[PDB]
Amino acid sequence: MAAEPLTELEESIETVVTTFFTFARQEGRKDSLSVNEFKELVTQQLPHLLKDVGSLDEKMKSLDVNQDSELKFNEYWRLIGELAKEIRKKKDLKIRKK
Amino acid sequence: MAAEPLTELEESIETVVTTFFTFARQEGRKDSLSVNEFKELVTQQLPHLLKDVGSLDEKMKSLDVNQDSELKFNEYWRLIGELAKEIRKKKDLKIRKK
Ligand SMILES: [Ca+2]
Ligand SMILES: [Ca+2]
Ligand SMILES: [Ca+2]
Ligand SMILES: [Ca+2]
């Protein structure tokens, strides 16, 4: 359900989970990102880093892929990954694979 | 002055990225964690979260889909999901939790 006490890495994985949760509460359902929580998060929280708040919709489609449009409790998480690499990885992903 | 703060999510991806990196560099290739390199994270800094510094092999196989014995940045990054999940999830089936 949630966290009793934490070491360093445990704190720093929490801080992003609480950010997730506090936003993700908004429309429906805290446990899933909804699309006026997600776009709010990129608009508000990410904007400098995810310098494409605009075409969130593409990232959403890429994230969701069951396409239930609940950005699920690890679909969503990927995003933090993309920012995590982005700092290192300006644009240079490409990939294409079925 | 300089020493300008970044957005909350920038701060938090950096703090985990730097931690990652100081392990990523331990052995060959300052991006990939090899087996020992990987085990060092859990062994050193992750006692409560994934209380299993035994079957790190299981995690490794679950993580390194290609089984190259390098968790590249993005492969390693998987763990952070399982962490960010566990802190909420942990054993939401039996325990309980806390
Ligand atoms: Ca929601
Ligand atoms: Ca979904
Ligand atoms: Ca290495
Ligand atoms: Ca690999």
UniProtKB/Swiss-Prot annotation, chains A, B:
For molecular function, the Gene Ontology terms on record are: calcium ion binding; calcium-dependent protein binding; copper ion binding; fibroblast growth factor binding; lipid binding; protein homodimerization activity; RAGE receptor binding; zinc ion binding
Which GO biological process entries does UniProt record here? mast cell degranulation; positive regulation of canonical NF-kappaB signal transduction; positive regulation of cytokine production; positive regulation of interleukin-1 alpha production; protein transport
Task: Identify the residues that the record assigns to the EF-hand domain, covering every copy.
Answer: 18-53
What are its GO cellular component terms? Answer: cytoplasm; cytosol; extracellular region; extracellular space; nucleolus; nucleoplasm; nucleus; perinuclear region of cytoplasm
InterPro entries reported in the protein's UniProt record = EF-hand-dom_pair, S100_Ca-bd_sub
- Keyword set for this entry? Calcium, Copper, Cytoplasm, Lipid-binding, Metal-binding, Phosphoprotein, Protein transport, Repeat, Secreted, Transport
Residues modified to Phosphoserine: 32
PANTHER family reported in the protein's UniProt record: PROTEIN S100-A13 (PTHR11639:SF57), S100 CALCIUM-BINDING PROTEIN (PTHR11639)
Q: What is this protein called?
A: Protein S100-A13
List the top taxonomic levels of the source. Eukaryota, Metazoa, Chordata, Craniata, Vertebrata
